[model samples]
Target: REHWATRLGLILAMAGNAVGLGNFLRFPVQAAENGGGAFMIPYIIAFLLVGIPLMWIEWAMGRYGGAQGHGTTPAIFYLLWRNRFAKILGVFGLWIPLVVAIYYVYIESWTLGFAIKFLVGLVPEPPPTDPDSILRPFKEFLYSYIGVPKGDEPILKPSLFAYIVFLITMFINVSILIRGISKGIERFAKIAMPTLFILAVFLVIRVFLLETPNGTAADGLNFLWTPDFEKLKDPGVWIAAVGQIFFTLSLGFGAIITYASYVRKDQDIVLSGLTAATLNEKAEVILGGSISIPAAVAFFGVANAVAIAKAGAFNLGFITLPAIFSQTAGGTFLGFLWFFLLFFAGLTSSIAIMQPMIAFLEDELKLSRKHAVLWTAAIVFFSAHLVMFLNKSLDEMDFWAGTIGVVFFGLTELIIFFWIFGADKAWEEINRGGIIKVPRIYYYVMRYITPAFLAVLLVVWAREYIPKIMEETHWTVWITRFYIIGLFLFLTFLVFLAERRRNHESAGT
Candidate 1:
């Protein structure tokens, strides 16, 4: 029931949550391969149509729930529809965040680990004459750093250093969480987000100033913004744009709903929503978009840069970045700060992502805050190891929980919020206590357009893509799927227990 210390602090916290790893690594990769300049058309459409409206929906839902003494989605959904089944539907909110955080925090620590690697001069700048050598060393180091053994199908064992940094990252998250909302999360966000922006701007400026024998960095910018009308005809580009919208903005996860719960009854959610959305969009499209791929273009020329980015987000970010940083004047310091910036952004996200479940433990189980925090921490720590050690497990879980589950849950909640809850009343809840009145047009957007898009997207994934992943025969893939199902069932059982306890108390009354 605690609230933010200030409105600015709350905005910072929410924006920080949306602009984590995906904003930096994922968005750039998606933009480069999809359509570059042509990507902006679908990208902005997705933002206007889906991203912004879904945010308003989440904010309205959260504030309404918190005012009624509930914060977690399971409790909040039941409050909306007054049905037992709503709680079961709400369980998806819990599952997705936990599934995401299990693997996300491990990657979060990689940023911190790399920062330390740079600080100690472990990062070596290859000579400017041989740009290819720069890519080879960093790429090899990344694989070895994560403990990938030589040759295909060998056993995977991550370095002791990786484990050490993960624990350190986990410790920071848990400590911030136990301190509660205003003092811990709000305070951290206020500090970290500003520093994150400053560092990213400095690096973006540095990258824009860069030139190499290959080309000027502005050429890369030109490449990014130059319309590829030929590529626009490809439906895959549009779908990739929508997917990036989800990842970049952190929609469909209900973390925004939980975060919005802390807002006061009379608070202006319209302004807050718009502010957070603008900040994250700029952080993704402007700052992150400017930094990663452009720097790659300057160093490796346009052809290799596009190839490197399309290769994988990790390859683009982890491998390409170190090589670029090593080549620059004051490269080591900038590299250290750049990775630390990512670690800071990631820590803020993992903190917000886990807070929803902590809210569930305390709200449903009636555990003390300390007990709730520690219990969730233990669950996360143990589960994270499965993704950490098992080969292919990370990719398996990412597809199921991260990609598929997110879109599925987004559609489910959109229907429950707008259709089942009554469209007119939902619209009023959205416009309530407005800093600005909601446009009449968005009533249709939320009730009709966004819902329709989510359905089409879910079907696309289900029919075209899910089968390919489902066909894989890897044992770790099956284990990961089982882990996902097993976790979902456990959370569903908790919903049942909470309902039974409520009925028991009412009967006694």
Candidate 2:
């Protein structure tokens, strides 16, 4: 029965969710790592073939589910086909968003902690020296801040301050979730999404203004746009690019499905879906790529910046950028805005991911909105705390639940909508309350290209990681696997119980 207060609100909420910390923290790094300018070839191709269609599919599917009195994937999957078994499979829908936020909120919390560091003038400043020297203070600060020694991975080393900031982040997320849809997620999206734009755009311009001893800002811009066309031959680059698209768009997380479930039945989902994807793509390509990588090149030159790029997104955003932020006169305020911008983006994302579980509780389990919020919050808080205590748990969760899981789940959605639900029927759902007439080409893409691409992607990943997952036997790695197994069964039991409750209610009637 809940609906977004306005079309603008719905669009913002969807766009804000799609445009996450990944837009900045993850996208540029992906672009550089996969083959610099050559990566955009596959990235754009994947966006067209995969991301855009999935957006339409989810909006269509969600609106259909909402009409059937279901918002979460479990029941929605059942409605796609009448099979109760399919509903059981939808457990991944609930499983993923919950699992992801377990560590996702922790990463989001680091943005908050870093933002605080800037606010309180705790921003690092190594003397004007060589790149490694300039980066040392930041490396030390990051290691100490996160309670890890230099060059060592997170081994339950998160500092007390880290946990404190995490709790603050949790309070913000839980409070918004408690307010329910119109008052909570939509209202915050209206503010945070637009503010995310302004902050990132301003910082991008600051990146433009920057000139360091190693190179100018334009060097990064050149590297980003200039194609090394030969790199296109590598399938690995293509895989990474598509993976980035899938991750950035938040496909298969069930967040979009849950959010779109709140849309009014005749509110132009087709146009709305395109608009949301557009916002995310622009944020990612222009704003996301523009800021972090440009700053890296501006400070360290494209050559060394490539090294920073390969060093990974975490090093770039948290360590590398902060060192560069201290290079200028207004670096403090700009630095504060940069991290806070990431925090806002991360917050919007975490909020959206939380909704599927909350929706499952309310729509299926029949928990009142407040109770749903409390139950989901309790689970996430304890889960997040557990992962924080053994921060490697976060990596394992990210690899399984966040990375590989989404691809598998997305294929299930693809199968249900396009294959099982019938092409014309799914097509009709996509165009139901539309604005522009979508060409049948996309229907064909969803039918063939997208599925083919995802199937291959999943297969290759399985070949690569199955052995790795099997061989990996560290305490943290094995412990997280068992934890996942436990959590998964618990979700299945809840789903079975809810089914019984509904069946009993019907019989009594």
Candidate 3:
């Protein structure tokens, strides 16, 4: 097995994987739009009940699978349960990140393009206008830069500049992946994670120092910190908290499992996993929560800030922030800093997203490392072009891959690891070479509470999302769904072939 060159490198890589756009881009929006302090109440609760436990579960499974020379989830599940259906279901873990990276890298590229444009003065300064309408120019810039023809039009032609940025993002990701685990992924994480922290702290400070027209920083902080207890009664608030925790920690994707598979057999996971989760939480709650919302509320006022938060993550990050940056002091330098921070966040996560499939091909199919990297990159590149051209496909992909897909995989992994594999042994696996002891209470929590929590989340998601999906059933939706399903089936078939070849080789040997 390929082990991490250093324990610190492994932890940083794991932290980098968890701390992505969600920590910076998604969490604050969810907090502002949801009941602020009310959201934090459930958010912290979900972290304990769901996030930490799931982190441990994934690390344990990955380390155990690594011990048996398996890198991806299908083989890991087969190792755990000895059931073919378990292997098939595990394909969800393998495929979700691959499919997500298809559209995710495209979004990641926006950060790169925006950062360069800001540095070169291509992002126009906000026009002299009513302070309330400051975001209009930014919105227009976003539409023009992405080549959106008009409202709700299919993107018939992608911007050459944007497409080049996309290619550059993929090239960077693939270049790092081909360098193998310790050298490429681990080394990059070591630098990116600390740089991300430094950039986040700087932005947080800069945003807080700016003055609002009608309010103090306290008002913005109050917007995030003051609990609207009444809002907690809404089921949607609770569900949003759960979803944020899942997405923020990069759980339910096979990235953690694949990353963990590179750890040495006796390396400590309990402390390492908990530490990574804690770092991600701090970035989300402290750094992320502080920057975007407060800046928006300070400059745009609470009402517009809320509206911006409601508009979606991309709108807030790409549209609203650029407008804010253009008007603020040292706008040019700060704008570059902000988008470059996003670029780093996205790059670290995107690299992790590409790893599971690369590892799968190398470990299971006997493919060379370079060949596996090329194959995975090609698939992601082509699939992303399809998303770039199709209207509403990104939303469909995000729903399945980023939202429901995560809950489904999390629920399945929890059941298999604790229920089928047995809690006692799983606990033992988690404890090997551990720095800190896990509480006995979590033993029961992982066995019963975690699965219960995930089951409810999955059911609630389906209840809400299934109707929308059915209502919007059309060629675009069907095509996207079929593409994802077909990809999964293709990978699962390869798994069978790989297993067959391995068995034959073992008999001959």
Q: Against the true structure, candidate 1 has what lDDT?
A: 0.84
How do all models score by TM-score?
0.97, 0.97, 0.97
- What lDDT tens digits, residue by residue, belong to model 3 across residues 1-509? 68899999998999989888898888988988885787888888899999999999899999999999998899999888998898888888778998888988888898999999888988765556576467777887777767765755555466789889898989999889999999899999989988999999999888888686666556788888886778767878888998888888889999999999999898899999999999888988888888888888887778878888887777888888778877767787898999999999999999988899998999998899999999999999998877888777888898888988887888889889888988888899888888888988999999989899888877876788678787866566887888888888888888789889989999998
1-509: candidate 2 lDDT, tens digit per residue: 79999999999999988999889988888887766798988888889998999889989899999987899888898988889789888999999999998988889999899899889987677876676788889888887777663445546678888889998998999999999899999999999988999998889888998887787778888888888889878878877887788789899899899999999888789888899999999999899989988888888777778888887558898888878887778787777898899999999999999999999889888999999988888899898766876656777898788888887888889899999988899999889889986777898899999999999888887787568776864666877888887888999999998899999999999
Candidate 2 achieves a global lDDT of 0.87
Judge candidate 3 at residue 23 and give its lDDT. 84
Candidate 3 similarity to native, TM-score = 0.97
Mark the 10 consecutive residues where model 2 has the least summed lDDT. Answer: 147-156
What TM-score does model 2 achieve against the real structure?
Answer: 0.97
Candidate 1 residue 451 C-alpha distance from true site, Å? 1.3
Q: Per-residue alpha-carbon lDDT of model 1 for 194-263, expressed as tens digits?
A: 9999989998998898888888788788878887778767777877888778766777777898888899
